[PDB]
Amino acid sequence: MKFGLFFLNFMNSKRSSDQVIEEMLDTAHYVDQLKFDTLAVYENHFSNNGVVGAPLTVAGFLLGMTKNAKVASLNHVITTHHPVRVAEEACLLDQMSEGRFAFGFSDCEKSADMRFFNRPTDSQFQLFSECHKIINDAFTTGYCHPNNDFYSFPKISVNPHAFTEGGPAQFVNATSKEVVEWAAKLGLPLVFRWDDSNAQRKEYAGLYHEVAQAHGVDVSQVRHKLTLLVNQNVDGEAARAEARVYLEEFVRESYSNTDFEQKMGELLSENAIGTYEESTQAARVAIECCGAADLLMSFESMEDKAQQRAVIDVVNANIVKYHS
Amino acid sequence: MKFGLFFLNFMNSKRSSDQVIEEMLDTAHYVDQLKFDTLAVYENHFSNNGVVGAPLTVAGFLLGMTKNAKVASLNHVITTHHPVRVAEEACLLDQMSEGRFAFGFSDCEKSADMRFFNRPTDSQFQLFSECHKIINDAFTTGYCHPNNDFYSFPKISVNPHAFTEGGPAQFVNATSKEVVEWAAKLGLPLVFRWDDSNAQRKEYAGLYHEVAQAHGVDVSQVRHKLTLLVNQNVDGEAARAEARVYLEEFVRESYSNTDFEQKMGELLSENAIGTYEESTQAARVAIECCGAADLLMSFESMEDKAQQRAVIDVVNANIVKYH
């Protein structure tokens, strides 16, 4: 397996956007040297729960400041951005970094964002697919020629052309069944979300697998990713309490209909939170029920830098290093 | 006077997109430990005359791989881009680099280019002024509230909030009198374009000065920039020749409705091309015409790497000694 790191960059009343970014940078540098495989960037708009609106811009600096690791967009929302712009941007990252960029994308998750980006809601999936078609066309051919109600424009050359044949590796955030089946037919690898339950995650995997074989897809060769929150404390009970506060607002905005306490409790126990073992096992379960080949972890919940790096070190030392 | 570099990143059948990106990268590094103050990036779409459509993404990488270096968008076309996105993107860079990014922006230099990204209009300059309005609001307040017609969205927050108080330094491309007047009115510094004639630049410079002062602006503190192409050769004729081939399709493209030979001949003579002497002379002249505070140069037209780097060498020593 491959083990990497993701940054959510959640902000708060005390913990500022300035701080988070800096922490992100310091950590990135810290693990540069280690056995971590990839550094993923979470996109979020208009809220405390993620201060990175432009994952691609962040990826440029991250790639710029590094030489080792791979950098990826975790959930680049294509559905609310112009596909041509995405292609160009992704292409530039691919070239500048000589193929170290990985393109993680997603459909629009919040209705607000969609409306906010003057995007037709009633046909979201169609638009998402269309946006995707434009991007992949660019990646794979160097050009685009849409002729539809979403886009209609004279054939164009999209510069720069991909450094990596076929464009930078792609992956789809598993946000829904529609998207999952879509990805299965295309045979693209997914990204199972740390915010979802194990059940959901598994159902999703059963879905993809079913669809994918149904499409002549060699599943054994598909490397799904999984994201999980990591927070290890000798006092397992404290680990939970710390992540709880870190996820308060997220749970209160993202998972509204769903009763709070139940979800919050589910997250604390399903994520790699608690003591070493507790932590370690949760991870094993998660992987197990979703079949992911690679893991990405977020250690951000650990407000203690000394404690956080410590955790990072054992994980690399006790886990990572072995898979190499 | 400050001296910086700019990248056009022009490709051709012979010189691929890959090639030119690499050279920029190398170049940026090579120049890092020098006296050059800034690294500027040119935006272009769907053509060989500029392979960088997102100078902001390039700015991130460039700043990421440098530490002392100043990086800027040369002519970011805001008109075609969501103003909100633009503000986040730029605030991110401001944060990440800790104040080392400069936001050089522009107004659509093409028409057809508009269609490929937004809803083209005629009241385009209005869209542009309103876009910049949104952008500067965040830059200065962290929030924006376009009550207007182009954009209407209630009070919203833009993260990250800026690293530099007031947002990153800004500068506008003098693409027309309309824009020049707007900038002046707002007290913004301009970027005089290497592709424009010395007379136009002087004009713009004069317009800016008059409008600005009448508006209570402190012109003394305005530091406009100027771009120029740089191609020095023992054989001044060989320098023009090389530059001519590099500028061929561009002249044909950006200046399709004017006499070719004349423009061409104008560019080759007013830019810092020729012999060292002709090059420097040409430079002084252009600087004196528009009165730029800082000079950004492009040395890309010199295909021979050793010759190019040498020119860069000569320039730097030259700044170290008198600047």
* B128: closest CA of chain A, how far (Å): 18
CA–CA dist B270, B228 (Å, integer): 9
Judged by CB atoms closer than 8 Å, whether chains meet at B57 and A58 is answered as: no
> Best of A11, A85, A114, A156 to disrupt the B interface by mutation (most B CBs within 10 Å)?
A85
CA–CA dist A122, B34 (Å, integer): 55
**Solved with:** X-ray
Judged by CB atoms closer than 8 Å, whether chains meet at A64 and B65 is answered as: yes
Q: What 8-state DSSP symbol labels residue A172?
A: E
CA–CA dist B268, B290 (Å, integer): 18
Judged by CB atoms closer than 8 Å, whether chains meet at A160 and B96 is answered as: no
Overall residue count recorded for chain B in this entry: 323
User: For residue B156, what is the nearest residue in chain A, using CA coordinates?
Assistant: A46
Overall residue count recorded for chain A in this entry: 324
User: For residue A95, what is the nearest residue in chain B, using CA coordinates?
Assistant: B18
CA–CA dist B71, B74 (Å, integer): 9
Provide the 10 A C-beta neighbour count for residue B54.
27
CA–CA dist A153, A146 (Å, integer): 6
Which has the closest alpha carbon to B95: B163, B165, B169? Answer: B163
* Helix or strand run (H / E) with residue A307: helix A305-314
Q: Are B133 and B147 in contact (CB under 8 A)?
A: no
Q: What 8-state DSSP symbol labels residue B298?
A: E
Which has the closest alpha carbon to A280: A256, A321, A314, A242? Answer: A314
User: Which residues are CB-neighbours of A220 under 8 A, at least 6 positions away?
Assistant: none
| Three-state DSSP class for residue A1 | coil
Pairing of β B156-157 and β B143-144: antiparallel
* B29: closest CA of chain A, how far (Å): 11
User: For residue B56, what is the nearest residue in chain A, using CA coordinates?
Assistant: A57
Judged by CB atoms closer than 8 Å, whether chains meet at A163 and B18 is answered as: yes
Q: What is the CA radius of gyration of chain A?
A: 19
Judged by CB atoms closer than 8 Å, whether chains meet at A18 and B117 is answered as: no
| Three-state DSSP class for residue A19 | helix
Amino acid at B256: S
* Helix or strand run (H / E) with residue A129: helix A124-141
DSSP string over B41-65: E----SSSS---S-HHHHHHHHHHT
Buried b (16+ CB within 10 A) or exposed e, B73-88: bbbbbbbbbbbbbbbb
Pairing of β A294-298 and β B2-7: unpaired
Judged by CB atoms closer than 8 Å, whether chains meet at B60 and A65 is answered as: no
Q: Which two tokens stand for residue A129?
A: 């697919």
CA atoms within 13 A on the CB side of B292: 27
Helix pair angle (B276-290, B236-254), 10° resolution: 40
**A298, β-bridge pairs:** A229
Q: What 8-state DSSP symbol labels residue A162?
A: P
Q: Are B93 and A25 in contact (CB under 8 A)?
A: no
CB contacts, 8 Å: A82 with chain B: 117
Helical H segments across chain B, by residue range: 17-32, 55-64, 83-96, 112-115, 124-141, 177-186, 198-214, 236-254, 260-270, 276-290, 305-322
Give CA angle at B97 (B95, B99), nearest 5°: 70
Buried b (16+ CB within 10 A) or exposed e, B206-220: ebbeebbeeeebebe
Q: Are B245 and B316 in contact (CB under 8 A)?
A: no
Partner-chain residue, chosen from A25, A92, A163, that has the shortest CB–CB distance to B57: A92
* A211: closest CA of chain B, how far (Å): 35
Q: Identify residues of A whose CB sits under 8 angstroms from chain B CBs.
A: 11, 17-18, 21, 25, 45-47, 51-54, 56-66, 81-82, 84-85, 88-89, 92-93, 95-97, 116-117, 153, 156-161, 163
Overall fold of domain B1-323: TIM Barrel (3.20.20)
| Three-state DSSP class for residue A151 | coil
* Helix or strand run (H / E) with residue A40: strand A38-41
- CA B179 to chain CA mean position, Å: 15
Judged by CB atoms closer than 8 Å, whether chains meet at B51 and A153 is answered as: no
> Best of A13, A89, A95 to disrupt the B interface by mutation (most B CBs within 10 Å)?
A95
* B277: closest CA of chain A, how far (Å): 36
* B169: closest CA of chain A, how far (Å): 18
Pairing of β A143-144 and β B156-157: unpaired
Partner-chain residue, chosen from A52, A156, A160, that has the shortest CB–CB distance to B21: A160
CA–CA dist A272, A229 (Å, integer): 6
**A274, β-bridge pairs:** A232
Helix pair angle (B17-32, A83-96), 10° resolution: 60
Judged by CB atoms closer than 8 Å, whether chains meet at B60 and A64 is answered as: yes
CA–CA dist A170, B260 (Å, integer): 45
Give CA angle at B97 (B96, B100), nearest 5°: 145
| Three-state DSSP class for residue A9 | coil
Q: Count interface pairs A-B at CB distance under 8 A.
A: 130
CA–CA dist B54, B293 (Å, integer): 26
Direct distance between the N- and C-terminal alpha carbons of chain A, in angstroms, rounded to an integer: 8
CA–CA dist A237, A168 (Å, integer): 42
CA–CA dist A276, A230 (Å, integer): 10
Residue with tokens 């990805």: A183
DSSP string over A79-125: GGS-HHHHHHHHHHHHHHTTS-EEEEEE----HHHHHHTT--GGGHH
| Three-state DSSP class for residue B28 | helix
Q: Are A262 and A300 in contact (CB under 8 A)?
A: no
Q: Are A271 and A280 in contact (CB under 8 A)?
A: no
Q: Which two tokens stand for residue A273?
A: 């939170």
Q: Are B155 and B142 in contact (CB under 8 A)?
A: no
* Helix or strand run (H / E) with residue A131: helix A124-141
CA–CA dist B78, B305 (Å, integer): 34
Q: Which two tokens stand for residue A71?
A: 């950098």
Pairing of β B294-298 and β B2-7: parallel
Amino acid at A190: L
* Helix or strand run (H / E) with residue B70: strand B70-77
Q: Are B297 and B6 in contact (CB under 8 A)?
A: yes
Beta-sheet strands, E only, within A212-286: 225-232, 272-274
CA–CA dist B130, B222 (Å, integer): 23
Judged by CB atoms closer than 8 Å, whether chains meet at B52 and A158 is answered as: no
Partner-chain residue, chosen from B64, B85, B160, that has the shortest CB–CB distance to A17: B160
Partner-chain residue, chosen from B46, B89, B161, that has the shortest CB–CB distance to A158: B46
> Best of B92, B134, B135 to disrupt the A interface by mutation (most A CBs within 10 Å)?
B92
* B160: closest CA of chain A, how far (Å): 6
Judged by CB atoms closer than 8 Å, whether chains meet at A21 and B160 is answered as: yes
CB contacts, 8 Å: B17 with chain A: 95, 159-161
* A92: closest CA of chain B, how far (Å): 7
CB contacts, 8 Å: A161 with chain B: 17
- CA B259 to chain CA mean position, Å: 25
Judged by CB atoms closer than 8 Å, whether chains meet at B160 and A51 is answered as: yes
Four-CA torsion A70, A75, A79, A84, nearest 10 degrees: -10
Buried b (16+ CB within 10 A) or exposed e, B251-286: beeebeeeeeeebbebbbebbbbbbbebbbebbeeb
Judged by CB atoms closer than 8 Å, whether chains meet at A58 and B21 is answered as: no
Q: Are A160 and A91 in contact (CB under 8 A)?
A: yes
Q: Are A225 and A292 in contact (CB under 8 A)?
A: yes
Q: How far is CA A294 from CA A4, B134, B227, in A?
A: 8, 41, 48
- What is the 3-state secondary structure of A173-230? ECCCHHHHHHHHHHCCCEEECCCCCHHHHHHHHHHHHHHHHHCCCCHHHCCCEEEEEE
Which has the closest alpha carbon to B60: B71, B52, B68? Answer: B71
Q: Are A97 and A38 in contact (CB under 8 A)?
A: no
Q: Are A94 and A101 in contact (CB under 8 A)?
A: yes
Provide the 10 A C-beta neighbour count for residue B119.
9
Judged by CB atoms closer than 8 Å, whether chains meet at A116 and B153 is answered as: yes
CA–CA dist B213, B175 (Å, integer): 20
Buried b (16+ CB within 10 A) or exposed e, A21-55: bebbbebbebbeebbbbbbbbbbbbbbbbbbbbbb
CATH number of A1-324: 3.20.20.30
